[PDB]
């Protein structure tokens, strides 16, 4: 029946849930809360020549 089973948010130191889509448009679907990606170098390291961080910056 086109069900999806995925894991729930838990802690660290029976845990999954099921979902069905009812509507014909994807703009009716619930929010996408479980996607956690990053790419910080876009803003923190926007330079042409790579800087090693153990070497001096200049010279």
């Amino acid at each position: 029946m086109g069900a999806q089973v995925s894991t729930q948010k838990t802690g660290a130191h029976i845990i999954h849930y099921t979902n069905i889509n009812y509507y014909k448009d994807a703009a009716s679907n619930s929010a996408n809360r479980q996607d956690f990606s990053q790419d910080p170098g876009k803003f923190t390291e926007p330079v042409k020549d790579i800087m090693v961080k153990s070497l001096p910056a200049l010279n």
Binding site: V5, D35, S37, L55
Partner: protein
Amino acid sequence: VVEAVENAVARVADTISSGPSNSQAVPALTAVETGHTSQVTPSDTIQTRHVRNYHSRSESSIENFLCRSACVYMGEYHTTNTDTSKLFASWTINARRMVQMRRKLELFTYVRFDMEVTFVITSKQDQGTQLGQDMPPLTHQIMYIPPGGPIPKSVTDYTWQTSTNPSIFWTEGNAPPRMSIPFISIGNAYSNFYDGWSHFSQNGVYGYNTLNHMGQIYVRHVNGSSPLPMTSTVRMYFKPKHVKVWVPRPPRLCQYKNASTVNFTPTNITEKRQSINYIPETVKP
């Protein structure tokens, strides 16, 4: 048929154990003039123990940061009046009149998403010397008009036929109405800031009001009733979902002035203290 989908949680980096050092590697010396932010950790500068860090950056993602309902408009309208225009409410759609949602959205230059729209409607018996009646439950009609549609003139205008415009009918005492709206803009994304004009001779309308153009909302009572006057209030709430944003910006410092412009009054950078060395004493008998 069942289909398993695996979710990857992204926790933060551990700290590695580090001992004494005496070498030519200088992690602490940098040069900000390059435009580069230093990627040093405590393990480069002190001696550290090994820690297994289990914390997650889940609640600071854009989707979790933005997916919460917020009020964007409030309006009132009466069941009976002698003005003929106080019997229905109407406005132009945007998210610029309530400062919290506006400032939150304005950390980014461009945004794109779908919306979930909720309405909250309440009523009240107008103050008077003669009170007391027996009214049936009130019903409300909400109609959305894209640009170019015919505009209602009164509460009995033919335009409330809503043959092609989407409308909601609702009765008091039930759960609040709701519907979802897709990403509707002639561009590839919504624009929060526009440094340009509407006319090719560099004049006319400046800035945001050139690009939005997303129709109007009209709301009326359906009963056409009330021997004694009554007032209703409608409030609109927005929640974005399936979000993408581009080009972060510094957050707003000055207080907002109007909904058409970015105009402001000059404000200080922060608040003052006694001295550049001042720090209060907190360990005293």
